[PDB]
Each structure stands twice: as structure tokens, then as C-alpha cells.
């Protein structure tokens, strides 16, 4: 790796890669803890009955031309993404 560095035209110099971390988005809780009073109240209400997408996997367990439309419009995000992946693999195994 020093022969391939002396055989290099330009060297933008911090060669060891800068370990920049995941940029701060507003889309995830950045401390994984209750921050305020409404956050802790909504989490203590949601902890007793919510999904780890178990019920989403159960409702995504599926097979008329409008019952499928109603189930798709009442699907969830991770269920829709996993079903898109499974249908993409199914279409790759089916078509050419």
C-alpha cells in the first residue's frame, strides 16, 4: 500500500477514512430514552400494547379484486417493504 501510494497522482490527504457517524435526523430518537413528559407518557401507554411488527407479519400473511386493495391500503410500512422484497424475489423467480 505504499507502492500504490507512491504510484498515485494526487493524494487528498487524510487517507485513513474519516469515521463520520450517522447524521442527526429528526426521524429517530437519538438517545432511545424518554426526553420529555409527553414522550414518557406516550411510551408508557404504548409499551403495554404495540407491535414489534408481529401483528404486522400476521396481517401481512395474506393470499376477488378489491379485498387485496383494502389489505394493501391497510398494510404497514415494514410489512409493505418486506412484502415488496418478497414480491420482487417472486417476480425474479417467475419472469425473465
Amino acid at each position: 500500500i505504499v507502492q500504490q501510494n507512491r504510484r498515485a497522482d494526487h493524494l487528498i490527504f487524510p487517507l485513513n477514512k474519516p469515521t463520520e457517524h450517522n447524521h442527526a435526523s429528526a426521524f429517530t430518537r437519538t438517545q432511545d430514552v424518554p426526553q420529555t413528559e409527553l414522550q414518557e407518557k406516550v411510551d408508557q401507554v404504548l409499551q403495554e400494547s404495540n407491535l414489534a411488527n408481529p401483528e404486522k407479519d400476521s396481517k401481512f400473511e395474506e393470499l376477488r379484486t378489491t379485498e387485496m386493495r383494502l389489505m394493501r391500503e391497510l398494510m404497514f410500512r415494514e410489512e409493505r417493504k418486506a412484502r415488496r422484497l418478497k414480491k420482487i424475489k417472486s417476480k425474479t423467480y417467475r419472469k425473465i
Binding site: 450517522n22 447524521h23 442527526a24 426526553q35
Partner: protein
């Protein structure tokens, strides 16, 4: 390694990203201390990335009290955890540049993944952004800073001295 800085204004808090690092050894040179007086070469250092104004003037007086006693208030907590990226375990601790070593440990306690720098370099580009000021925001605010700190100054003085109303 100064990646972000937090500037506290009368209208609200601002958080700037640092694009280019200022030079560390030649920081007492004429040609470096003049680029924080040139605006078109100070903006090659500092990009504005967030600005949360105070909702009410009562909250403006409250934040001024909390900064003067060095405490962290909730709007400051909001803007910090919006803007600052969460780091990994101990590698690449993210870095603020704040203006006082008393605000240091309090936001260190509120954010253990954040490191605070207040040295000559931090106060240098702090006073650069204080000098240029409202030209950084390019109108992205609701407030004029001199009249805003006029009202805030009379408020803070009155609340400090307990000036009577009757």
C-alpha cells in the same frame, strides 16, 4: 476538530456547522485575524445550519437567565439534540464550540456523546460570527437584533434588580 458551534442570540439560538477548520498554530497572525473581519472569507469557514427563535419574549428573558446562570434550558436542549449527530461508543466524540466553561459541564451532563470546546479558537470564531451577525442568516429570522437586545436588556436588568411596579 471543532465541527459545530452554538451561538446564543437575543432572538433565539443558532447552531453553525464548520466547513473548513481555522489554522491552529498561526492563529495569532495578521492574515488569519483579518479573515474574521472579512465577511466573504469568514463565510468560507462557517455555514448556518439551524436557528430556533424564542417563541415569546418571556421565554427570551428565561433563556437569558438560564444562560447567565450557566444552566441548560429546554429550547437549547431541543436545538442541540436536533442538530448534533449521535456518536458511537468513544470513537469520534462530536464537538461543540461554546462560549463558556460554565455552560460546558451542564450540556456535557445533558449529552454525554457531545464534547465542548471553549478555547481561544472557539472564542475567536464566536466573536467572528458575533461581529458579522445578521448577515449570516440571510433574513432567516423574525427579529432585529439591536432592538431585541434593547428590550431584553431592560427586562434582564429589571428582573435582576427587582425593580418595583407600584
Amino acid at each position: 476538530p471543532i465541527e459545530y458551534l452554538l451561538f446564543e442570540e437575543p432572538t433565539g439560538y443558532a447552531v453553525f456547522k464548520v466547513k473548513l477548520q481555522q489554522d491552529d498554530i498561526g492563529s495569532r497572525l495578521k492574515e488569519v485575524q483579518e479573515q474574521i473581519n472579512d465577511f466573504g472569507a469568514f463565510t468560507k469557514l462557517i455555514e448556518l445550519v439551524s436557528f430556533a427563535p424564542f417563541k415569546g419574549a418571556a421565554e427570551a428573558l428565561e433563556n437569558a437567565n438560564d444562560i447567565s446562570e450557566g444552566l441548560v434550558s429546554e429550547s437549547l436542549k431541543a436545538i442541540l439534540d436536533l442538530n448534533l449527530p449521535k456518536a458511537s461508543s468513544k470513537k469520534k466524540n462530536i464537538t461543540l464550540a461554546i462560549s463558556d466553561k460554565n455552560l460546558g459541564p451542564s450540556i456535557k451532563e445533558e449529552f454525554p456523546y457531545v464534547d465542548c470546546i471553549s478555547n481561544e479558537l472557539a472564542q475567536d470564531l464566536i466573536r467572528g460570527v458575533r461581529l458579522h451577525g445578521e448577515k449570516l442568516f440571510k433574513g432567516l429570522q423574525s427579529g432585529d437584533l439591536e432592538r431585541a437586545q434593547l428590550g431584553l436588556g431592560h427586562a434582564y436588568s429589571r428582573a435582576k434588580v427587582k425593580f418595583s411596579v407600584q
